[PDB]
Homo-oligomer: 253 residues x 4
């Protein structure tokens, strides 16, 4: 019997601008059984509030603010835990840069204690240079998420992970990456879930980001053939998830 | 105030055949304060009993059997957690192969549910072939530890990580690695420690295996300039440990 | 107008134990026009003589011994060119070890000037250890071919490239690799061809080993959908070969 | 007896704004013996003319324009050799973009036949996106040089190779890289040199870019402890160059 649920957002409880009624129902059912759950996303542009509002406004999902855990939150928690200088140079969208500054880390492009990098659609050589120099001086190099690509209406564009690799190559230092499928975001989400590791299960549509997040961190997994990972691709997966479903509606608590 | 201690064995509380009185004293002091602690090692050849006996016989350290957590134990716990077939093909020393079989996984070189690989000083092409074929058929590919080398009286020889890479290249599947600095061994050790993540601290002499284990998994770190990582090398480290000491004797609980 | 032809053996002018009449005819046609050509193979087990005999006995192809250029020959030529000690430690089949010794490099497992590695179906940890130690001491690390796998009647087994990666990881030194698609074998084959680079063309069935060999080394390419690379896979290739044919019979000199 | 000389520019015959009289003399001596030589640089910002003028104006070196071979020239030669569409999307300084357009490849950011990438100190996400999309559609992905860093008065900044890796990760296609130490620039430089491979020798100050260029491509090497690779670092080199000198003045033709 699973006591807690970790759930991916986009691709699982909705897809793009389109919704997935089974997904919305899944959350409602969880709320009805009063089963704890946390929505985990690698998105670093929208704040928890924005995410909460989007869910209620566009997908009939009304969930407490505390159930929304993003890579931005995980990154700040990690920064607070490691406790090094209260300065950071951040590469990313305005939202991420704002969240970090408001969390107490003022922007310092010269000798920051931390260099945090997420997707920045306004990336410039100068920003990369600033980060490279700071990392070389000893700043703690952190990546918000490893995704090599970001799927947009325009196509498969460069993701945070691609930018991170550029910096890794230029500085020779491997960034500590927070988001799925890495350990930190999963550990913290698990912590908020308030359940023991073997009592939780990660629910998602993306094999590489969600299911691997489970397998790699010793957490049970439920893969829904909706979203990214197509149903025909499952037989070829290197490691089968613990459960595979075509719709969350098939899940029985 | 740190409430629990994760501690590396070789290089920290002793070195090679030589001992480190400060290290032995560190454990004794922990025992006196009744502070929980777990000795974590990536070694897969000696059983917990063997390790316990070695400590008492050669280094005046008498510690309960439950305080000794190895990569072998972590690997078996993981195998038990994932719960797939009770079969496995194992590459490693007789000790590792025995522990896995006795844990309930009979050797099956044809269609094992798991393929477990650790250091095997008797590695042969045939064993690699057996593992490769099994992995290709869908077996869950697990590595006991990532170390690229194993330091012996003969010199820096090929470690489990080097063998793992051969297999990764041959099968195109990345192994889930259990030992330090990866998540699973640290999560389980933390679990046995019985303390919250932010209340623990990882103590070691090796920056890459012990300190990185802390940083990567959001656990405080204490680096002792004894062992592997020389004291002159510390200024150049990409991420400074939370604490650096020349001797464990300098530590004040 | 192409003046010289570099041609892959297995998969192009024959496949496995099965033959390809169009392939055999291709060579015969070349001989008739008196167009220079060199057969290039990454195989390190059969000597040029063995290869020559196999061609005549099993595939009606009678070609001069000098038209057969293997990775073994290329490797020895390279060793002779670099001119370092006349000693080498070799990992591979008896044929390769013999060819190197007969080329003037006596086996020295302690301080060889060169460490040469090709596929060895009798690979052992001891041999890997011998190679690792020798490389660490400064021996020039050479790989006969990069192939990650070797297709056998038993299936896709570990190739020379997989063994090479194990050593690369264990020693931290990248091996200089001779065979296709690397530069050395192509440069030397081109040299024996007696034609200028832009006047030659590489003919093969394997995109990764033969066509990439051309593209990477600025040599025209002719891909035959026979062998390894299936015809449906061609549209997805990252770089299209200069020419694509379903049969060599379609080629017009 | 060496009949031809391939020589690195910066770090060898001068360093930064500072000059190296021994270097300048080396070229003059070559000119006196009428020994053929080609100056090879991975720099893609200055045209051959600019390079020629700089040498004469700032370092008393007057050399024919044809003796200056850059990665830009090598890249264009390669593009002309492969002969695919006369369109290309280029990421780099204005100089590189201009040279490619003037070589007959008009800028097409939608469906270019080639996507060429060199260092661009004005890199933007949009340019990376344009390149990523084009590569995905089948454009031939070319990198001017592999250098992970570019040393500037500001420090060790991101080089062309770092940008190339971002793109490789985002598209999953490995770029064919032209500059040192890869094969194409060396083959073409050798061609202009007008000598046989074993009769030439690569002279440089950088082990990774110049000496490796020799070793990897079977060309003799002369390492001058001036520039990048410090003299104390030589004993630890994985492969010793054929010759090591503290000053070019020590060289005897």
């Amino acid at each position: 019997t699973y006591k807690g649920y970790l759930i991916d957002l986009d691709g699982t409880i909705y897809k793009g601008k389109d919704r997935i009624p089974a997904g919305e129902d899944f959350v409602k059912r969880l709320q009805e059984r009063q089963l704890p759950y946390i929505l985990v996303t690698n998105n670093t542009t929208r704040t928890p509030e924005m995410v909460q509002e989007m869910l209620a406004t566009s997908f009939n999902i009304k969930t407490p603010l505390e159930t929304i855990y993003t890579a931005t939150l995980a990154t700040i928690d990690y920064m607070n835990d490691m406790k090094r200088g209260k300065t950071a140079y951040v590469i990313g969208e305005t939202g991420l840069k704002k969240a970090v500054a408001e969390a107490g880390y003022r922007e310092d492009s010269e000798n920051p204690a931390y260099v945090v990098v997420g997707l920045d659609t306004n990336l410039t050589y100068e920003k990369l240079t600033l980060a490279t120099l700071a990392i070389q001086k000893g700043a703690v190099f952190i990546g918000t998420n490893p995704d090599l690509n970001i799927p947009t209406e325009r196509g498969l564009l460069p993701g945070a992970g691609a930018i991170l690799f550029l910096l890794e190559k230029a500085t020779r230092v491997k960034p500590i990456i927070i988001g799925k499928p890495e350990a930190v975001i999963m550990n913290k989400a698990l912590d908020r879930l308030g359940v023991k590791r073997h009592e939780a299960i990660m629910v998602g549509d993306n094999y590489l980001t969600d299911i691997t997040a489970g397998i790699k961190n010793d957490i049970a997994t439920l893969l829904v053939t909706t979203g990214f990972t197509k149903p025909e691709e499952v037989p070829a997966l290197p490691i089968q998830p613990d459960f595979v479903l075509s719709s969350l509606a098939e899940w029985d608590f």
